[PDB]
Amino acid sequence: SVNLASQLREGTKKSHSMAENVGFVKCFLKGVVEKNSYRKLVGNLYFVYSAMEEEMAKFKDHPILSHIYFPELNRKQSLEQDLQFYYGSNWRQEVKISAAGQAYVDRVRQVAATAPELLVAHSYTRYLGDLSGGQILKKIAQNAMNLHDGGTAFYEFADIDDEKAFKNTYRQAMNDLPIDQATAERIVDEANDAFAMNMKMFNELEGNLIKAIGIMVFNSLT
Numbered sequence: 120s121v122n123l124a125s126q127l128r129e130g131t132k133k134s135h136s137m138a139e140n141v142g143f144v145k146c147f148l149k150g151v152v153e154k155n156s157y158r159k160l161v162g163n164l165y166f167v168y169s170a171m172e173e174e175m176a177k178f179k180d181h182p183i184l185s186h187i188y189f190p191e192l193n194r195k196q197s198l199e200q201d202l203q204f205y206y207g208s209n210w211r212q213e214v215k216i217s218a219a220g221q222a223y224v225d226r227v228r229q230v231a232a233t234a235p236e237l238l239v240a241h242s243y244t245r246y247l248g249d250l251s252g253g254q255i256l257k258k259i260a261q262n263a264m265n266l267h268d269g270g271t272a273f274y275e276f277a278d279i280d281d282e283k284a285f286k287n288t289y290r291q292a293m294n295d296l297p298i299d300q301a302t303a304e305r306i307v308d309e310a311n312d313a314f315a316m317n318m319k320m321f322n323e324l325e326g327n328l329i330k331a332i333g334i335m336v337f338n339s340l341t
């Protein structure tokens with residue numbers, strides 16, 4: 120009805136660019152990532168996806184959300200697998216959520232009570248990004264931390280054979296959404312909001328990464 124697929128893509132161009140330039144991210148890209156700080160990121164996303172996937176299931180048959188309801192995208196379980204790897208068997212007891220992460224979860228829950236359609240901005244921001252960057256991020260992680268196997272279940276969509284073909288069904292799904300350009304714009308704005316929320320989680324880890332860096336180099340000089 121409106122073609123938000125291209126509106127979201129062009130509309131979040133700037134934000135995605137700022138995302139790549141966050142200190143934490145810059146270091147990640149250049150291969151310097153470390154188990155302890157990255158472990159906290161996984162804990163946060165774990166709660167955000169839980170929130171999002173639970174609410175999305177309530178709207179499996181909603182006039183709008185039902186169109187972008189692909190339980191094949193669900194990351195909660197794979198993320199639990201990663202916590203197990205980074206934290207071990209007692210992970211339920213060691214995993215925690217940060218303030219930014221809580222704010223993130225809070226927004227998802229809020230939007231789900233008064234503007235369920237804004238949930239497409241959240242599904243878009245996470246899932247379509249996970250789908251598109253998943254392979255690059257996985258290798259960089261695997262190389263920078265040595266994860267021959269385990270620790271990257273999050274970047275692997277098991278229940279999706281042809282992912283490029285899924286990425287189309289998904290964009291298509293968005294382009295066939297029963298919404299008016301007015302709201303389609305509230306969705307785009309919400310997407311830029313979500314990006315900022317991801318970026319805030321990354322910034323929370325800057326300090327943890329600095330120490331770790333100082334520690335490895337100090338150990339090197341010694």
Ligand code: HEM
Binds near residue numbers: 128129138252
């Ligand atoms: C704040 C964290 C990030 C979020 C929320 C995010 C989300 C997204 C979204 C929603 C898209 C789909 C755009 C579209 O086709 O409409 C996308 C594309 C992509 N992202 Fe990210 N992204 C983030 C950071 C990164 C990072 C750190 C990299 C660099 C390794 C990256 C690599 C990519 C790639 C390679 C694509 C595919 C571009 C294309 O379709 O031509 N992303 N991302």
Ligand SMILES: [Cl-]
Binds near residue numbers: 132135
């Ligand atoms: Cl992009």
Ligand SMILES: [Cl-]
Binds near residue numbers: 312
């Ligand atoms: Cl905000």
